[PDB]
Amino acid sequence: AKSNSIIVSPRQRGNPVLKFVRNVPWEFGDVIPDYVLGQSTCALFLSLRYHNLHPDYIHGRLQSLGKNFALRVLLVQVDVKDPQQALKELAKMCILADCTLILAWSPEEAGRYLETYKAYEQKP
């Protein structure tokens, strides 16, 4: 009826964050975003290293949410030593796509953020 659990797409199964994500109930069900925290609130997982290799993945992700969801949080995970170029483009695109840019220096930061975000359900 309502998101009591985070719905994660199975394609992101095997990531360290899900491996230790446990504070909040979550399950796989394949959704348009990466982690859906609510029917109108979604979080995206974008590895900066992955964007660094494939920039188009995140753009299409945002295009899809553009109509589907209201509140869209983009969680970026830093993996490279010089992530500033990607962060610039990610931040700016967030302006254009109206998504909250969240930065994570590890899967830990990502996990704690997801868990605490859905535990509260408080907009950022």
Curated annotation (Swiss-Prot):
Which residues are connected by disulfide bridges in this protein?
none
| Post-translational modifications reported in the UniProt record | Ubiquitinated with both 'Lys-48' and 'Lys-63' linkages. Deubiquitinated by USP45.
- Segments spanning the bilayer are none
Residue ranges for the DNA-binding region feature of this UniProt entry:
39-61
| Quaternary structure and partners | Heterodimer composed of ERCC1 isoform 1 and ERCC4/XPF. Interacts with USP45.
- Recorded family membership: Belongs to the ERCC1/RAD10/SWI10 family.
Q: Which disease is it linked to?
A: Cerebro-oculo-facio-skeletal syndrome 4: A disorder of prenatal onset characterized by microcephaly, congenital cataracts, facial dysmorphism, neurogenic arthrogryposis, growth failure and severe psychomotor retardation. COFS is considered to be part of the nucleotide-excision repair disorders spectrum that include also xeroderma pigmentosum, trichothiodystrophy and Cockayne syndrome.
Q: Give the protein name, as stated in the record.
A: DNA excision repair protein ERCC-1
Q: Which organism is it from?
A: Homo sapiens (Human)
Q: What is the lineage of its organism?
A: Eukaryota, Metazoa, Chordata, Craniata, Vertebrata
Relative to the complete UniProt sequence, the shown stretch is: 96 to 219 of 297
